[PDB]
């Protein structure tokens, strides 16, 4: 003795049910080991991938931010915002593309800078990070009063900056601390490439179509 409730005959939905096997007694080919199984998309966010900071109105030349001897010591090399879901430099990264499949995200990110110039080149850069509320610094001296790092080409060929937290915002700018120094018979201009990634605490919510 049973009674039928208001939700009976509907298939409208994402419900996880059980159907009948269409071919009972069929044996699928057994499993063998295949290297490289990835069980979560959230650890694909954590690999560093090249970030198009240039993206000015070019091809593979959009991936690298040029640096040279600019004859004016304190100057702004480049800048980019830190939100991965927004249209911009982060569309080229893998963390930015799989944020477009979700509604919300939160956590910490890191950014890595590689200097590609010659072994003979020497100089310093100033890399600053402005919190979500504040507008970007107007001058080099305003940028050093907050979070920053001074980075030296000769001593250090790569540097990392962990931005502390973000939600679906923060701006990071690069300043010339010194002029670009070279010995004779050496090329005067070089490049830098940025790599975006997400940290361990980064999370995602409510999947959506891209």
């Amino acid at each position: 003795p049973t009674e039928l409730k208001p939700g009976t005959n509907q298939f409208l939905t994402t419900d996880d049910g059980t159907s009948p096997p269409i071919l009972p007694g069929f044996e699928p080919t057994p499993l063998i080991h295949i290297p490289g199984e990835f069980t979560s998309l959230l650890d694909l966010c954590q690999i560093e991938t090249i970030l198009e900071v240039n993206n000015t109105t070019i091809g593979v030349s959009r991936l690298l931010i040029p640096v040279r001897a600019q004859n004016n010591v304190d100057q702004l090399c480049a800048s980019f915002q830190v939100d991965p879901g927004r249209n911009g430099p982060w569309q080229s990264t893998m963390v930015g593309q799989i944020c477009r499949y979700y509604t919300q995200w939160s956590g910490s990110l890191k950014v890595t800078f590689m200097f590609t110039g010659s072994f003979m080149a020497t100089g310093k850069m100033l890399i600053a990070y402005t919190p979500p509320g504040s507008a970007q610094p107007a001058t080099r001296e305003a940028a050093m009063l907050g979070t920053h790092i001074v980075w030296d080409f000769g001593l250090q060929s790569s540097v990392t900056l962990v931005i502390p937290w973000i939600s679906n915002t923060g701006i990071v700018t690069i300043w010339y601390q010194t002029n670009f120094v070279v010995p004779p018979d050496t090329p005067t201009e070089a490049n830098i490439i940025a790599l975006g990634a997400a940290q361990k605490n980064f999370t995602l919510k409510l999947c959506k179509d891209t």
């Binding site: 690999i47 560093e48 991938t49 090249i50 970030l51 198009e52 991936l63 893998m94 593309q97 790599l195």
Partner: peptide
């Protein structure tokens, strides 16, 4: 496919 993500 983008070269940017070939680091995967």
């Amino acid at each position: 496919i983008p070269l940017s993500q070939a680091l995967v």
